[PDB]
Design a protein around this ligand. Structure first.
Ligand SMILES: Nc1nc2c(ncn2[C@@H]2O[C@@H](COP(=O)(O)O)[C@@H](O)[C@H]2O)c(=O)[nH]1
Ligand SMILES: Nc1nc2c(ncn2[C@@H]2O[C@@H](COP(=O)(O)O)[C@@H](O)[C@H]2O)c(=O)[nH]1
Ligand SMILES: Nc1nc2c(ncn2[C@@H]2O[C@H](COP(=O)(O)O)[C@@H](O)[C@H]2O)c(=O)[nH]1
Ligand SMILES: Nc1nc2c(ncn2[C@@H]2O[C@H](COP(=O)(O)O)[C@@H](O)[C@H]2O)c(=O)[nH]1
Ligand SMILES: O=C([O-])C(=O)[O-]
Ligand SMILES: O=C([O-])C(=O)[O-]
Ligand SMILES: O=C([O-])C(=O)[O-]
Ligand SMILES: O=C([O-])C(=O)[O-]
Ligand SMILES: C[As](C)(=O)[O-]
Ligand SMILES: C[As](C)(=O)[O-]
Ligand SMILES: [Cl-]
Ligand SMILES: [Cl-]
Ligand SMILES: [Zn+2]
Ligand SMILES: [Zn+2]
Lengths: 354, 354
């Protein structure tokens, strides 16, 4: 089947795209393979902002044999000049016979323009092959470019009885869960937390450990601290790397002098739009306490909740994970369960609102 | 390997034992295969109290060819007369060459006596083959016979935030979890609940639905209701089948006239010992509210907790699953996680105290 061969090669391209997962932000993960007479002649992936696009690497490998070949690309070749020349033009120049595209461009202001340039040159273009699987490569980018809002993941860690701490915030989950969290942080443009967490935990919320990846190649998440009374202590550990920190609160000259980006107090929905529009942050991880976590949930600002549950009971006086006060069952916040996995002694659920 | 062949056949016997899982109580699940010249000549399992033991069925099949053969039995052949003749004597009579035993007898007053009868006849006896796997056939019976206390499973159903109901007991988990609970009920000699649950839910706590098993062959759990003020309404659904009901509370002639077994108010640990010693109940399922469930937990009376968690948030005013008031993290009740599975939209954890 010609469809199944197209799917076979696009799946190779989707695999290449994953080599950049942690280093591409704000740019999309993109793979590309070039195939001729059923033979692979060029592979490429986008490693990092400012570096060449996937198609460019793949063509450099393919060389002159790219003429008459088929290019499989997980995303629509670009039609504009920025830090690099446009990919649609490179494919034309290489005189490929056919370009197969998984996802069209999510930005409505440019969508279809790359394909159009291919149509004009007489290049065969078919679109939609393994689109579902390719979309999983770019949940944040695709959402942010099509709607102006980032993809938001809420992380929570609790006991079996749904508690996050004793009455006084003494603290559940183990090292396997901690390692898993590294992955979620490393695909995020920002980790959002509240001042309460920073004061209680003195956390860094950064990426320090990943499987099969050198941490120096990681594009680190910005640490976004919601601090409405401007209480962030200057000695906080989260401030050792100040240029990757943003504080939402009353303007403090101490913070500006350190290079910390300061945001005016704004509604959570507006905050998310700001991060996407002004700061190119398309994947957000929330790592916060009950109050801030519940605010995001109740305002309907969560795309996915990642819940770590530890095999322990903390009792009815320990801190509730979700602090809404509901009366009737009809008010419950129901989610669709995607999956559950075991992480040593903990478990992790992934959940999508309904 | 002679060990691996012994293991191969014992595993066939362990499999046969499972055919009686739901109908054997209070008797143990027991399988038996008879093998000669590497050929299976007889299989047997114990189906139900009063019926022949596994070895008897297997020998009836083996017939005269049982002479010189090897018998694999998941539990030590009995050495005493009750409702049936003793199995040790049947094997001798059949003139088997060798008897392979997984689990020795758990009752210390009779342990080794069956083996002794085999030793005396010159019959080869080796013991311990796939013991771990065979023990899983009889968690309750083996515990109760060796210690006088039943194996106790605590079932709980909660939201992700560890809640069981709204402030007023309005009620989470779905049909897949409900079906799973049927299995746990069907291996139990008793389901224990409190009056609060009976009043709120009007539950039956019986077995009505099982995979690949006719419900008429099931030996139903007794429904044990803890009712210290004697409030059980005579119109309660749990009372439609009164002879399988036990109430712990102040004596009521209304209940005796219906045939309900009445227990005097006693401590929970004493209650469990009573059920085992006086009523031959070796596997207990607790299906109760927060108060009674927490009492069992805090008194250290739980062997295993089976926790069903639904993908929903009920909020901080909904009923806590565990009502202890702890202050420090050191007071937490920690469990070892055995496994987690997905049940459609819910999950189930199995947990063992530490
Ligand atoms: N690559 C990767 N994926 C992880 C990790 N931890 C959890 N996951 C998630 O768990 C798997 C679930 O499959 P999915 O349905 O998301 O494709 C992965 O796809 C990924 O989303 C991790 O450490 N590395
Ligand atoms: N046979 C059976 N086992 C179940 C069912 N639901 C849960 N289980 C448990 O889940 C599996 C876990 O394997 P185990 O470690 O207990 O041998 C089974 O062994 C059994 O204990 C059920 O409906 N039928
Ligand atoms: N903890 C915390 N909650 C916030 C913050 N900003 C907004 N919220 C909560 O989000 C909800 C809606 O407020 P808005 O997002 O419209 O400002 C309110 O319940 C508010 O308390 C914040 O910076 N920190
Ligand atoms: N809800 C409930 N709790 C009980 C019952 N029997 C004992 N408990 C609880 O178990 C704990 C120890 O009491 P004991 O088991 O020594 O009578 C106490 O906290 C007590 O309230 C009962 O029948 N129902
Ligand atoms: O990033 C690269 O080096 C590539 O795609 O070859
Ligand atoms: O600092 C606070 O209290 C806040 O952010 O709301
Ligand atoms: O129970 C039976 O009928 C058996 O074991 O053959
Ligand atoms: O009925 C009650 O309140 C009880 O059992 O404790
Ligand atoms: C598919 As592209 C964003 O590398 O032109
Ligand atoms: C192993 As038996 C209890 O059937 O004698
Ligand atoms: Cl916080
Ligand atoms: Cl109860
Ligand atoms: Zn491009
Ligand atoms: Zn017997």
């Amino acid at each position: 089947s010609e469809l199944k061969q197209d799917q076979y090669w696009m799946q190779q391209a989707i695999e290449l795209a994953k080599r950049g997962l942690y280093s591409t932000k704000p740019n999309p993960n993109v793979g590309c393979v070039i195939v001729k007479d059923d033979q692979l002649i060029g592979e490429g992936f986008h490693p990092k902002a400012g570096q060449p696009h996937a198609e460019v690497f793949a063509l450099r490998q393919a060389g002159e044999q790219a003429q008459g070949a088929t290019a499989y690309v997980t995303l629509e070749p670009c039609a504009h000049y920025g830090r690099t020349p446009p990919c649609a033009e490179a494919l034309v120049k290489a005189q490929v016979k056919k370009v197969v595209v998984a996802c069209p461009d999510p930005n409505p202001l440019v969508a279809g323009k790359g394909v159009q340039i291919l149509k004009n040159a007489g290049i065969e273009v078919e679109i939609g092959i393994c689109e579902d699987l390719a979309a999983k490569l770019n949940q944040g980018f695709l959402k942010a470019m099509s709607t102006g809002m980032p993809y938001v993941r809420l992380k929570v860690a609790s006991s079996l009885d749904g508690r996050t701490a004793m009455a006084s915030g003494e603290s559940i989950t183990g090292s396997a869960a901690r390692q898993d969290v590294q992955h979620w942080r490393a695909i995020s443009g920002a980790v959002i937390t509240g001042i309460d967490t920073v004061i209680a935990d003195d956390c860094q919320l950064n990426v320090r450990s990943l499987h099969n990846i050198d941490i120096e190649t990681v594009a680190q998440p910005k640490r976004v601290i919601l601090d409405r009374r401007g209480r962030l202590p200057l000695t906080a550990k989260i401030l050792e790397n100040p240029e990757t920190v943003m504080v939402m609160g009353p303007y403090r000259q101490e913070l500006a002098d350190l290079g910390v980006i300061q945001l005016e107090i704004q509604p959570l929905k507006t905050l998310l739009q700001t991060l996407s529009k002004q700061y190119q942050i398309y994947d957000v991880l929330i790592e916060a306490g009950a109050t801030l976590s519940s605010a995001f949930l109740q305002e309907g600002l969560i795309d996915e909740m990642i819940s770590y549950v530890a095999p322990t009971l903390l009792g009815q006086s320990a801190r509730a994970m979700f602090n809404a006060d509901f009366e009737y069952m009809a008010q419950q916040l129901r989610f669709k369960l995607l999956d559950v996995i075991q992480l040593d002694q903990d478990i992790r659920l992934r959940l999508i609102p309904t």
